[PDB]
Write a protein that binds this ligand. Sequence first.
Ligand SMILES: CC(=O)N1CCCCC[C@H]1c1ccco1
Lengths: 237, 300
Amino acid sequence: GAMNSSNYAELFNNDIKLFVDDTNVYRVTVHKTFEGNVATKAINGCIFTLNPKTGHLFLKIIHTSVWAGQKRLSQLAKWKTAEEVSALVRSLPKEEQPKQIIVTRKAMLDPLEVHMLDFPNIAIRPTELRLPFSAAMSIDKLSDVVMKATEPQMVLFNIYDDWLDRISSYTAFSRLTLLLRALKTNEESAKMILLSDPTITIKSYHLWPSFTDEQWITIESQMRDLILTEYGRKYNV
Amino acid sequence: MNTVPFTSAPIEVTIGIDQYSFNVKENQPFHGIKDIPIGHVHVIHFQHADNSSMRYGYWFDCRMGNFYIQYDPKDGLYKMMEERDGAKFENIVHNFKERQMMVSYPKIDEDDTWYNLTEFVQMDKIRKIVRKDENQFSYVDSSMTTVQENELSDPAHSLNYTVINFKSREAIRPGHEMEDFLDKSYYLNTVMLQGIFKNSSNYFGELQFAFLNAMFFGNYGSSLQWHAMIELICSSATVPKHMLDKLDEILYYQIKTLPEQYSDILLNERVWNICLYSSFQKNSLHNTEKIMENKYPELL
Ligand SMILES: CC(=O)N1CCCCC[C@H]1c1ccco1
């Protein structure tokens, strides 16, 4: 069934599962042609395939060449996603394959169901949560590796850095989504919050700054304030 | 012209023959149906006055034997049976005809509806969907489930229609996932037509038979099968020209014949709107689209 507020803890149990977000797979800039018409130019994208328990992120970079000569790119994009997720599961050892794959957008269900016919015991599920994974390209290190890619490429990251050494997966996922929700609502402000203090650095092998527990609490508060504000600034409240 | 005598009519029942029906009262002196046209299959069907639940009936073809109906008070239904003694049968029929205890298959001569609804339906194929090889005729009722329905519980009473499943390895070639899912021509032409059905006549015959069980018995799995066979064709970019023209004619006579008051449950909005307005064949079904719009524009 679908994933929602009521079965939220199931993300952190011991059954392997992955989220797939496809929002950033097909990305374009829209521009004007000399004749005054409009054209898109594709830029590199990615699939965002995430273990919410362990933080393991399978970042599949979608190089603009995959679109060359193809029609109906937004529809092709869902099937390419499904194709690349299925290839990923097949590459994993049996004991690492998921038991469930949760798609953040219902339009992926049929494309992934069809690609995964060989895996009848892997449940493909939608979700009712409005997850902010589109904002993954607001994470500078991830954005950098996507734009720089000159061929198709899988990159591996832990999106929790080292947080699980100190906090539980439930708490690591809540932090991640708060950060990503802030980055999505006001990227400039969110990034200002994260880097304001020059003395807090990002490890070479991390995505986020090395905050102490006390500083994470301050950071988390500041991100909540931002999201409430923007909800005011937007709705005037 | 052939005849299906009835031993008697001990319970009040609405009797159908093909698209015709008549009411028979309890112990009314009714003894069967004559002038049935040779060369087509037929279906005789029953709805008891007391339990409108369970519509049931018998697919038969008079060229294959002498058949009659006799009520069974133990099993509580009108049963079809075969009389092997040809002289006993002619003798019974002639006496009933002489006493004019029979209704006449009331075929208007201008009317080709029955031919047009059973054009490709053949008893030999019916008997493979409805498995009961000791009889030359086939019992169907409202509640019989399909092979496919059972998969998702008594096999001896199943309707063994051809399983069609758009999200199945049969339907989807490895490496062509999106091609085959969005354009089912492979599944139609290679898998189903060339592979399973052998030709389009057998395909259309199962499709027409499924429609008829849906309409006459409210058989829900039949209705699912009829719509699935339509959708497979509508969702194939590449369909022989003769098949599309015949499909249009087939579906036209099915929509024409449907009771106007049953269109809510026998017609699947999604399939029809897709087939008439969104599918590859959205422009290839003129007669069907014309009658659907003038008769059931609400569904659309
Ligand atoms: C635990 C591990 O060795 N890796 C790969 C290297 C980067 C850290 C994340 C993690 C990973 C991501 C996906 C799979 O595994």
